Amino acid sequence: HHKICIGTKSRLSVPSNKEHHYRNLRDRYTNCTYVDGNLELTWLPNENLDLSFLDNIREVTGYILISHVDVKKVVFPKLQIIRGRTLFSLSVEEEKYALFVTYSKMYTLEIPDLRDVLNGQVGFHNNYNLCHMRTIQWSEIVSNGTDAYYNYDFTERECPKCHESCTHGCWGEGPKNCQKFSKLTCSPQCAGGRCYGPKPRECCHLFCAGGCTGPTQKDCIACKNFFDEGVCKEECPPMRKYNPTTYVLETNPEGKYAYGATCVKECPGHLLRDNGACVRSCPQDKMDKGGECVPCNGPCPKTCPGVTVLHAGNIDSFRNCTVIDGNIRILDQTFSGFQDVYANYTMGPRYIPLDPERLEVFSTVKEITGYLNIEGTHPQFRNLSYFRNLETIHGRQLMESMFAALAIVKSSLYSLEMRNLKQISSGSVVIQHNRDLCYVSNIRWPAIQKEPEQKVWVNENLRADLCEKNGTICSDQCNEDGCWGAGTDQCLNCKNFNFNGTCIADCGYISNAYKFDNRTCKICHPECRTCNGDHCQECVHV
Amino acid sequence: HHKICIGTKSRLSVPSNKEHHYRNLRDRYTNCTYVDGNLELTWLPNENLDLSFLDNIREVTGYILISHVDVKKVVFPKLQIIRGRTLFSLSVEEEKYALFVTYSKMYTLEIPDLRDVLNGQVGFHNNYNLCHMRTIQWSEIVSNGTDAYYNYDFTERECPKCHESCTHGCWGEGPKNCQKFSKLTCSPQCAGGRCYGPKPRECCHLFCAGGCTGPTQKDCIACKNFFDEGVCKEECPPMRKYNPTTYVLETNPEGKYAYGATCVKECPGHLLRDNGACVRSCPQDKMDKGGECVPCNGPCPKTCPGVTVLHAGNIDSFRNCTVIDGNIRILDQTFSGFQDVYANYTMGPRYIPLDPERLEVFSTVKEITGYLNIEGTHPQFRNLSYFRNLETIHGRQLMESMFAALAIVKSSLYSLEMRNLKQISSGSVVIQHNRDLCYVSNIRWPAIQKEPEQKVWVNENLRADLCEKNGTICSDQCNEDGCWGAGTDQCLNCKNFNFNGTCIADCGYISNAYKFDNRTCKICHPECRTCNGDHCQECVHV
């Protein structure tokens, strides 16, 4: 089977709860065959952790980083290809690494099926117990490298021989762990490339990546160019063919989209469709339609980059943004005065505390492509009416924990007030530990969530009974879907009648009372003061 | 140099004035190197006509048809390639021809530089004097054929030998006319393809079309695939490159558009830009922006195909059309009752005369991509107010005569009344022989014409003095650009003040009189009856 993971880019971050970190890693990689990004295998103190969530990973597009891993036996039993499209280093001066194993206590690291590292280097740095790596002939695997990089200091067990049957080095004990060869055992005429046997003629294709199962093209393990239901192509079958006689772009029933070095019938949901390609953002002159990048009309909607943490120093950059291309994180430090730390742990600028009032800058925001994360605490930070015009959170990017698209945790909020929020396209709702927050438990989140597989974790906010005793419940004019707050304009869906954007029992409860259907009103024209449509009761002028 | 002609598709039509036909042919092909379409060389009765307008034609994409040509010597001195993307036949059962010479009295037909007919056959049919064609070894030229097709009946001069120096056949006298060979004299290893010399190894490229000047690719005479400032490519450099790491379509500074088998920096004006291709129409879901096919918004503008001649039977198909993709021809037969004739001259359906009133169907038309041609006569057909909302004639297709985009000839019109017409994008204005038509001579046509090279032929309508004596002149509120008719809403540009779409001396001449600039008014809000902006004179209500 084939299944896609989004990789991570946390580099050397230390998780607080190492147990949730485990859960996160597990939830992320289980049954995944293909990592879009970097596989970061980090901080697993227990020696006997079961890492079988790694069991189906076949290819990684970025780098593999193994840091602070003390599980005795760490095996990647099906990993074949590390592409190294993005690489890892401790610093600017260090080598760029596709495989980096560092500060880990594992006794073995087994990748018996590993074939090829397409780009970057292999490094081992201060792993006290790791065995066999020097028996591995690395120029067999590393495409642009001689050997692995080793480093040991700070003060070394004797180490077992490879299995009887190995012709050369191994990744560990038993015959399954003997290094195989598909590049060094080949003859020339192969000009250094891979092959499925010793003799000439049988040198894979040229397009092949990681080697091959037979003669050519349809027989590759993976591809140096585009990969298409099994065959390597120089390009994906375009979505339309140009007929040079007729001057027509005829649509192609076998056309496909380029997603990375992959040809695909539809772009994965975390990317948009631009021409024949799956892309991360629309270009400057385009906008997002139905998941498709398309020329605009008037001015294009003012769209702004997200920031990694909101604070006094960067909040004004969202002035007039309609769409935010990225995430929004409002944290404690947002309010208390955010402090730049740099890698070398040299203190950067520090910004003044943020006055929640300034959050009003978001009132023009209609879309967030990433996620929205709220964690801060402030006396005057009591709701999300700042986002009263936000109508969709795409979640094309999710949080490290629980695949969250909306996470509200340990905040000082009393109500949401996000009256326009209609879709959370992807990912989950986490709303926990907000000591004064009501409403969230009576909101039917699946209503606004697009998929059934999307999840809801909403608890340990304000106890149901203690909201009810303050009247901080829904207006009796909301249906059972709940509300963002006590307002009549705060319902998800309306029980009786909806008018103007507010919610009424009658439709007759007001001067103008023209009914448009089962549930709806509308104003009685400029001229009527009272009507039901051309004609009415208490008239006006011209 | 390089210059592009649009070819014709008139097949065997007989022109009335054979002298204007000559002029037309001349104006069409002079200095052209490349025919986009068919070269139709027809009906040239005089024996001593100078056909030097053919002198630079290098390649034709469609077919060459020579019919009723009695010029003694007809030479194509630089023609190299007939592609035969579209072919000619007298009927369904006949062969499909890329070169067809028929019912012509020429003594010779000289194409000394002809190399290759890429597709279709070569035919000679009832040419009484034509010489040398049987000496030409045709399998040298015809890619998918044995020999030329001959036919002679209806009742043959003796014919001169080729020049002393010819190794084989010729197109006529003198050493310049000896057939050259670049396909038959080649060895194999060439597998039947062309070459620049006898020995193996030197077999052109494979992409080459018509042969080659040296070894390979950059050395082709022309291309079987795309042609790019001189080199044959399997595809044009795309306009954006997809970066598979970053998931971005990066724009390509060396990208180009596909125009036929041609790569080009910009689409010729008779085509639009759709993705990387130059196209004839936008697809169903797109529309025309700045010469670019682009997704729509609301419903796409209702756009309808043109018809070859307007008449009672097809007029309703334009119900609600906003854009007409094609031409509009209103002819005498439109009004008198149009009669279908078929090739075999069997009478088709006949439609009832057309009541000009029905022309009102065009009132929604804002754009005509082709040309607009008006020739009919009817007592009640007195102006073009039917087209009162037409704002641009693109002229992406022009008339056979004078490159006309707007032609009004021998019509019963008194005035135009096309108050919204702002652009004739391409081609010319011909307005001649309308016995009762005024205005047209005082309209500054260059105002609405986009290019300076565009031309104006406006004469022999109603004599200037005889319009003036009926008051059928411009309102004294138009500037010197003239008008479409006597209305105040009929000026091209306004002298004093423009308001609502009509034209006034004062701006004060009316109840509401708020001035927005040097020349403009606007209504005084719902509430004022008299103002100048918030405040005014004779007020109203709420």
Ligand SMILES: *[C@@H]1O[C@H](CO)[C@@H](O[C@@H]2O[C@H](CO)[C@@H](O[C@@H]3O[C@H](CO)[C@@H](O)[C@H](O)[C@@H]3O)[C@H](O)[C@H]2NC(C)=O)[C@H](O)[C@H]1NC(C)=O
């Ligand atoms: C601690 O860490 C930070 C960054 O990790 C250091 O600040 C950075 O200093 C570097 C030089 O190492 C700056 O690079 C320079 O960039 C400019 C403009 O792009 C260029 O003209 C120079 O040639 C140079 O390459 C960089 O801008 C700056 N970055 C940041 C984010 O401040 C800092 O100096 C380190 N502190 C200590 C005590 O070592």
Ligand SMILES: *[C@@H]1O[C@H](CO)[C@@H](O[C@@H]2O[C@H](CO)[C@@H](O[C@@H]3O[C@H](CO)[C@@H](O)[C@H](O)[C@@H]3O)[C@H](O)[C@H]2NC(C)=O)[C@H](O)[C@H]1NC(C)=O
């Ligand atoms: C949802 O949150 C919004 C934004 O915080 C709340 O509206 C704000 O309510 C506060 C507290 O009552 C207002 O503070 C006052 O401002 C006035 C003049 O602006 C000042 O003179 C007072 O002494 C006081 O500081 C604030 O103005 C008001 N902001 C806006 C933009 O309306 C709203 O109360 C929240 N909804 C609920 C149910 O809490």
Ligand SMILES: *[C@@H]1O[C@H](CO)[C@@H](O[C@@H]2O[C@H](CO)[C@@H](O[C@@H]3O[C@H](CO)[C@@H](O)[C@H](O)[C@@H]3O)[C@H](O)[C@H]2NC(C)=O)[C@H](O)[C@H]1NC(C)=O
């Ligand atoms: C005179 O000329 C016209 C056309 O040039 C002839 O009318 C055409 O008759 C043909 C058969 O020769 C029709 O083709 C048929 O088309 C249908 C549907 O597409 C198909 O099912 C049949 O197998 C057949 O191929 C064609 O529709 C029709 N075209 C038009 C425009 O009327 C006409 O019959 C000729 N008259 C004489 C006296 O020979």
Ligand SMILES: *[C@@H]1O[C@H](CO)[C@@H](O[C@@H]2O[C@H](CO)[C@@H](O[C@@H]3O[C@H](CO)[C@@H](O)[C@H](O)[C@@H]3O)[C@H](O)[C@H]2NC(C)=O)[C@H](O)[C@H]1NC(C)=O
């Ligand atoms: C521009 O051409 C339009 C369209 O032909 C002219 O408007 C038309 O004027 C004619 C002749 O006066 C009108 O005919 C009359 O129609 C009425 C009722 O519709 C009928 O009862 C009369 O006995 C007579 O047949 C016609 O209605 C009118 N059409 C429209 C759509 O307004 C207009 O006169 C032309 N402008 C100039 C300066 O000629």
